[PDB]
Write a protein that binds this ligand. Structure first.
Ligand SMILES: *[B@@]([O])(O[C][C][O])C1=[C][C]=[C][C]=[C]1
Ligand SMILES: [Cl-]
Length: 363
């Protein structure tokens, strides 16, 4: 019958449309993996000015969802014995020898517990090897490594950069030549080809100023990925089924499904952040709130790494000045979703769309 497809469209429309109107989102793509099948729902405009509609192939900036790709490359380095999570950071970049990175682990960098590395590089640090070098050489922790989580692009960016160093190639090259092809991703880019630019959505800010992400230090590692809803769902499906990949990449994905500590309801993995499932919408919003991004929190370390599988929701938000993304999946239910928009709209609203969809699929 047509009832299931009609029901799914009705559910996704009912979840998405009021939130798009309420946050004046010009265009939004949803992709859902359900019972081993992909489903796409596209809304609105990729560009208000030329009238290009969103499709499942439209490219959006995914911001910090890029950190899950960065974690997958690090997973590869780790499970190939090129690095270990307890290595000191300076083991992998001689320029950092003699700095405070002699006493900071790769795990600390990956999980934002190095001791107060900030949300962003200061404006004074441009996309320049020497300026990035000099930034880290001069940095000092605010509190003991391993004690407080402070969400940080310089932190996990350095983790990614060191993972690439451990593999002997530039991060950007490894992603394009190895990681994206291993995951089967042909619509996923750090640097969108000229031939694909027609697919790149416009981003919109205050007063609808047009905003696409510019170059910045460790941009590739932290927030560099542009992808389509269809490709990002393929990446979600790889996370749901790492066993469908060749074993070296399966292991790499598995390494991003291990939790190291808790803050409140959230368990921190490499890239991914996990919750018990089910949990209330308000608790999931709290985990994805502004204070979780901007303020330090004392961690509760786990006695050993915890498998992030079964009845858990793994998620990540991502933002750039013009874009807002959210990905969530439930390993034990073989369920995944992607929500990509061309406005940076509040995380709570992203989570509200996802939760309405997940609730509807349950009920
Ligand atoms: B990233 O998009 O994280 C915010 C949404 O969780 C991000 C963080 C810091 C700098 C650039 C991008
Ligand atoms: Cl930054």
């Amino acid at each position: 019958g047509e009832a299931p497809a009609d029901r799914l469209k009705a559910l996704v429309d009912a979840a998405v449309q009021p939130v798009m109107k309420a946050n004046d989102i010009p265009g939004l793509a949803v992709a859902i993996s359900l019972k081993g099948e992909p489903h796409y729902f596209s809304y609105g405009l990729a560009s208000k000015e030329d009238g290009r509609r969103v499709t499942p192939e439209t490219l959006f900036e995914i911001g910090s969802v890029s950190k899950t790709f960065t974690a997958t490359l690090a997973g590869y380095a780790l499970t190939q014995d090129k690095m270990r999570l307890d290595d000191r950071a300076s083991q992998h970049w001689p320029a950092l020898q003699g700095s405070r990175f002699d006493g900071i682990s790769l795990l600390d960098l990956a999980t934002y517990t190095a001791g107060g590395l900030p949300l962003q590089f200061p404006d004074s640090v441009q996309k320049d090897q020497a300026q990035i070098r000099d930034y880290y050489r001069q940095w000092q922790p605010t509190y003991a490594p391993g004690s407080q989580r402070l969400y940080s692009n310089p932190s996990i960016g350095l983790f990614g950069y060191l993972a690439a160093r451990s593999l002997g190639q530039p991060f950007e090259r490894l992603m394009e030549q190895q990681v994206f092809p291993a995951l089967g991703l042909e619509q996923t880019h750090l640097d969108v080809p000229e031939a694909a630019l027609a697919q790149y959505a416009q981003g919109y800010g205050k007063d609808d100023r047009p905003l696409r992400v510019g170059p910045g230090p460790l941009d590739a590692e932290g927030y560099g990925v542009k992808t389509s809803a269809a490709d990002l769902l393929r990446f979600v499906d790889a996370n749901l089924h790492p066993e469908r990949l060749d074993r070296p990449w399966a292991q790499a994905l598995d390494a991003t499904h291990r939790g190291y500590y808790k803050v409140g309801d959230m368990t921190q993995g490499l890239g991914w952040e996990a919750y018990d499932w089910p949990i209330s919408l308000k608790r999931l919003q709290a985990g994805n709130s502004t204070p979780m991004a901007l303020q330090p929190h004392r961690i509760a370390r786990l006695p050993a790494p915890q498998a992030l599988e079964g009845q858990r929701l793994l998620n990540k938000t991502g933002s750039t000045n013009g874009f807002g993304a959210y990905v969530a999946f439930v390993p034990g239910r073989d369920l995944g979703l992607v929500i990509l928009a061309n406005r940076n709209y509040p995380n709570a609203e992203r989570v509200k769309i996802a939760y309405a969809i997940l609730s509807g699929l349950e009920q």
